[PDB]
Amino acid sequence: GQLYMGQQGPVQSSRTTFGVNPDRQANARPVYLAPAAPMENTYTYLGSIQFAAGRHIFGEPASNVLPPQNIVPGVPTKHGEYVTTNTGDRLMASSTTVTRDVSNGRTKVSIDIPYYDRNAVETLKASAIPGAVAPVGSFKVNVEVLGGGVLTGTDANAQFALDELLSNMLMDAARIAQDGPKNTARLVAASHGVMPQA
Amino acid sequence: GQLYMGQQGPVQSSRTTFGVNPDRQANARPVYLAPAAPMENTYTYLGSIQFAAGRHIFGEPASNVLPPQNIVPGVPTKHGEYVTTNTGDRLMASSTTVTRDVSNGRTKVSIDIPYYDRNAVETLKASAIPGAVAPVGSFKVNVEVLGGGVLTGTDANAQFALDELLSNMLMDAARIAQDGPKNTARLVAASHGVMPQA
Amino acid sequence: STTVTRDVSNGRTKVSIDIPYYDRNAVETLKASAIPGAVAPVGSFKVNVEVL
Amino acid sequence: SSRTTFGVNPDRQANARPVYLAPAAPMENTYTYLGSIQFAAGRHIFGEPASNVLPPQNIVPGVPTKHGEYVTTNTGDRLMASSTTVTRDVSNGRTKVSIDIPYYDRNAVETLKASAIPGAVAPVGSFKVNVEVLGGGVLTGTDANAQFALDELLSNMLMDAARIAQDGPKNTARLVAASHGVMPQA
Amino acid sequence: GQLYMGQQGPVQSSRTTFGVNPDRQANARPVYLAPAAPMENT
């Protein structure tokens, strides 16, 4: 490579793999599985807008905090679900689901909430029809933490520090995801991004 | 080509491309995007006929002037939509849409309004059935301005004059489209044109 | 020629208007120089209207 | 594969960075000077532009291009319309702006004017000026903020180069019909 | 040569020796010869 001046004389710079231990520690670490899933932020906002945005009408949950669906204390699982059942006036009750998959150092949490056709629901109310409406679509939010491949000398204590580091990256990621003025479009029906000049 | 008399003597007429600059100016001009779409003419007529022509029954709009659906101030788009929601007695509410596409010097505005089956709606009212009717079809009107390829010396000020020229061609085109006595058939279910002898 | 075209078929009626334009630089150079050349159109502008 | 390096690491950053493209080209300096000399020097007569700021000819907003042109039309008395062109090329970290303005034969133009005869005249030649920035080879460590700093560094070298090119008394020959360069004494 | 617009159409510019009389008159003209040379300035 390039040439520089060492005390022996002019010496060639060199790039070597000598002295780098890339060995990894196996993803064999049991992790804490919450006994319920708190959806407080989303449901307080849904109470704020009165469970209706435009033509999307939403169901009222059973609880702001979701109970486990297929998780039992003391039984290890790689897939766990929490669920409640949204209900509403002239709405067929429909479940809202929070899924957690923990495999090979990869943790992934997904949230799926359904909605209904407000045009149909208000037609039902206004002309005094006796039927109900089934869900029309959903919205989904996924979050993923790739925490595999810790190094071999990673202390049992230092894995907790790494835990907190990843959780702070999580917070930063969601903030960057929703960052922006609420005067302007930023998430739904997205086509492309346009950052403003000033 | 042909022969004529020039002062040098009999001279051959000639047709050349010398001295004609056909260079064009790129379609890189931001255009004004209305903050709402006024449909006043069509909806005043729809109030005139009481939202019913024959078997076609129409919905009553939310507003004569339509708000933006996916347009945000200060965000440039090549596609923008305005919408309201028609409602009616024993009619499932249904949206009426006004679409504007602005690409490569071509501006295109389309209007789509739905209608419903009056035979079904009056059956509902007359025999006191509790259901409602969904839209049965629509009518659409398209308008297109091909304003691409302005010349290179077109002044910034003169592009406004060209703007107004195109808008006047628009007016003339719609007048030619609907021109004719209202005693005789001229638009819907059209098969061919027959201009009268006298 | 400036042209207005009407197509009526299968319930769809469509009116199109096409007007041509010439190179003002060529025309005015000819006029100022008192040259007897006549200029052919360099382009056109078009407006379409359609009823389904 | 991760390797520890002793000495210089010459890894360069790939030239894969979009750059800002002006929506028009300002030519204010040259056209104000052309107005100053009444669009005529010696036997060279120039045309009057439609605008001092040139609009894009083949550039569309939001569409990446590696070659773009701004253009206007010079018109003149007894003259055939001739376009003045500003070309910008961006490729592989090298960005180059070229300016081309045509001129005409003043003897033909004023002989026609004085003879009151129908002729008109086309351009005889042009003058061209090129400017080139070799910005490739950014090192690996450089982040975006540092790249902005490098942007401004190159622009300052640009200004220095133009000043060094035009440097000298206006009493004396310095650019056109150049044969060789000579330095004065004391 | 170059091309321009004449009233017949686009026409080629041309450079000719037609109509230029370069004939010269012989140097056969007696000239005045001063009867003395004034060097007053020097």
Side-chain angles (χ1 to χ4, degrees):
Chain A
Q2 293 284 344
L3 211 57
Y4 63 95
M5 203 80 78
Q7 53 176 17
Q8 307 272 306
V11 171
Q12 208 168 354
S13 58
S14 71
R15 316 180 40 176
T16 189
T17 185
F18 196 49
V20 182
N21 190 0
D23 291 339
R24 296 299 202 279
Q25 191 168 332
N27 306 330
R29 180 161 179 262
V31 298
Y32 172 89
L33 193 57
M39 282 180 79
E40 283 161 359
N41 281 285
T42 188
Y43 271 123
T44 67
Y45 180 76
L46 273 183
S48 170
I49 63 174
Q50 209 188 339
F51 300 98
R55 184 175 174 173
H56 296 273
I57 197 175
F58 290 85
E60 286 188 17
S63 299
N64 289 327
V65 173
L66 280 67
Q69 183 172 16
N70 64 13
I71 303 171
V72 171
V75 176
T77 82
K78 290 190 169 190
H79 177 84
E81 295 182 351
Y82 314 92
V83 63
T84 56
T85 57
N86 310 337
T87 56
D89 179 22
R90 299 173 178 278
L91 300 177
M92 169 162 182
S94 67
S95 49
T96 187
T97 52
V98 173
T99 286
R100 185 167 183 163
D101 283 307
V102 175
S103 294
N104 219 36
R106 161 185 175 276
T107 308
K108 182 181 182 177
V109 168
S110 63
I111 294 171
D112 172 80
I113 63 169
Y115 55 78
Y116 310 72
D117 194 358
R118 191 162 83 161
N119 290 19
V121 176
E122 264 178 31
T123 293
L124 286 179
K125 292 193 296 191
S127 56
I129 318 180
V133 181
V136 166
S138 69
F139 284 104
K140 292 181 68 180
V141 169
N142 295 336
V143 159
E144 194 178 7
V145 176
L146 304 157
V150 299
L151 299 175
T152 43
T154 303
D155 189 4
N157 285 315
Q159 313 209 19
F160 299 81
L162 291 172
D163 274 3
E164 184 65 38
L165 165 60
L166 285 188
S167 52
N168 270 311
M169 301 175 60
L170 264 183
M171 298 301 304
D172 274 316
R175 187 194 165 179
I176 296 173
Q178 73 183 47
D179 186 9
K182 319 179 183 302
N183 313 346
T184 192
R186 55 187 193 286
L187 276 195
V188 300
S191 175
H192 51 268
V194 176
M195 71 162 269
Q197 297 175 332
Chain B
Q2 293 284 344
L3 211 57
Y4 63 95
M5 203 80 78
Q7 53 176 17
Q8 307 272 306
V11 171
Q12 208 168 354
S13 58
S14 71
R15 316 180 40 176
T16 189
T17 185
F18 196 49
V20 182
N21 190 0
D23 291 339
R24 296 298 202 279
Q25 191 168 332
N27 306 330
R29 180 161 179 262
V31 298
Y32 172 89
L33 193 57
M39 282 180 78
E40 283 161 359
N41 281 285
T42 188
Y43 271 123
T44 67
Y45 180 76
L46 273 183
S48 170
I49 63 174
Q50 209 188 339
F51 300 98
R55 184 174 174 173
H56 296 273
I57 197 175
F58 290 85
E60 286 188 17
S63 299
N64 289 327
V65 173
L66 280 67
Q69 183 172 15
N70 64 13
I71 303 171
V72 171
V75 176
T77 82
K78 290 190 169 190
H79 177 84
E81 295 182 351
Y82 314 92
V83 63
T84 56
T85 56
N86 310 337
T87 56
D89 179 22
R90 299 173 178 278
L91 300 177
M92 169 162 182
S94 67
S95 49
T96 187
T97 52
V98 173
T99 286
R100 185 167 183 163
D101 283 307
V102 175
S103 294
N104 219 36
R106 161 185 175 276
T107 307
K108 182 181 182 177
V109 168
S110 63
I111 294 171
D112 172 79
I113 63 169
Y115 55 78
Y116 310 72
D117 194 358
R118 191 162 83 161
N119 289 19
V121 176
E122 264 178 31
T123 293
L124 286 179
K125 292 193 296 191
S127 56
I129 318 180
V133 181
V136 166
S138 69
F139 284 104
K140 292 181 68 180
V141 169
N142 296 336
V143 159
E144 194 178 7
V145 176
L146 304 157
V150 299
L151 299 175
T152 43
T154 303
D155 189 4
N157 285 315
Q159 313 209 19
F160 299 81
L162 291 172
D163 274 3
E164 184 65 38
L165 165 60
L166 285 188
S167 52
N168 270 311
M169 301 175 60
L170 264 183
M171 298 301 304
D172 274 316
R175 187 194 165 179
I176 296 172
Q178 73 183 47
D179 186 9
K182 319 179 183 302
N183 313 346
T184 192
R186 55 187 193 286
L187 276 195
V188 301
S191 175
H192 51 268
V194 176
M195 71 162 269
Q197 298 175 332
Chain C
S1 290
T2 187
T3 57
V4 178
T5 312
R6 196 167 181 162
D7 298 305
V8 187
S9 75
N10 210 35
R12 178 190 72 87
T13 188
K14 174 177 183 176
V15 167
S16 55
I17 293 182
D18 171 270
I19 63 177
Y21 59 81
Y22 314 79
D23 182 41
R24 185 182 183 177
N25 277 350
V27 170
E28 285 192 354
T29 298
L30 293 173
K31 282 160 84 174
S33 299
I35 293 182
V39 185
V42 177
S44 73
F45 284 112
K46 292 178 68 183
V47 170
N48 291 339
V49 170
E50 187 180 12
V51 175
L52 294 174
Chain D
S1 73
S2 85
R3 36 179 58 95
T4 66
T5 186
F6 297 80
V8 169
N9 183 340
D11 292 330
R12 301 304 208 273
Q13 203 163 344
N15 294 346
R17 171 168 178 259
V19 299
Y20 173 88
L21 197 57
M27 271 178 71
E28 296 175 352
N29 277 330
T30 183
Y31 273 123
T32 60
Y33 179 73
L34 273 183
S36 173
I37 51 179
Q38 284 156 0
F39 295 108
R43 211 180 103 191
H44 298 286
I45 187 175
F46 294 89
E48 295 189 20
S51 294
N52 273 11
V53 179
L54 277 69
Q57 164 184 344
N58 67 350
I59 303 172
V60 176
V63 177
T65 71
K66 286 182 174 189
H67 172 90
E69 301 183 348
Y70 314 89
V71 60
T72 191
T73 63
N74 314 341
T75 70
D77 194 53
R78 286 300 167 97
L79 295 181
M80 299 190 185
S82 71
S83 293
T84 286
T85 56
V86 175
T87 299
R88 183 167 185 163
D89 288 11
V90 177
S91 66
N92 256 341
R94 159 185 182 277
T95 187
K96 170 175 180 180
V97 169
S98 65
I99 296 177
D100 173 87
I101 61 174
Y103 54 80
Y104 309 79
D105 184 15
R106 194 183 183 184
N107 222 45
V109 169
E110 263 172 358
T111 311
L112 293 179
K113 271 194 304 184
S115 64
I117 271 174
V121 165
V124 187
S126 63
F127 284 111
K128 293 179 69 186
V129 170
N130 294 338
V131 167
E132 186 183 10
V133 172
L134 306 175
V138 173
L139 278 167
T140 306
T142 308
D143 75 349
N145 273 331
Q147 286 186 26
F148 296 110
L150 294 177
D151 279 321
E152 184 70 3
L153 176 64
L154 289 182
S155 53
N156 270 305
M157 305 169 62
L158 256 191
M159 295 304 302
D160 276 313
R163 183 199 165 173
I164 295 174
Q166 77 179 5
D167 199 16
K170 308 169 175 178
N171 292 325
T172 75
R174 53 184 198 286
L175 289 181
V176 305
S179 171
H180 51 265
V182 191
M183 184 187 286
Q185 304 190 300
Chain E
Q2 293 284 344
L3 211 57
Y4 63 95
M5 203 80 78
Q7 53 176 17
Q8 307 272 306
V11 171
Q12 208 168 354
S13 58
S14 71
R15 316 180 39 176
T16 189
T17 185
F18 196 49
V20 182
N21 190 0
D23 291 339
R24 296 299 202 279
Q25 191 168 332
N27 306 330
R29 180 161 179 262
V31 298
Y32 172 89
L33 193 57
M39 282 180 78
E40 283 161 359
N41 281 285
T42 188

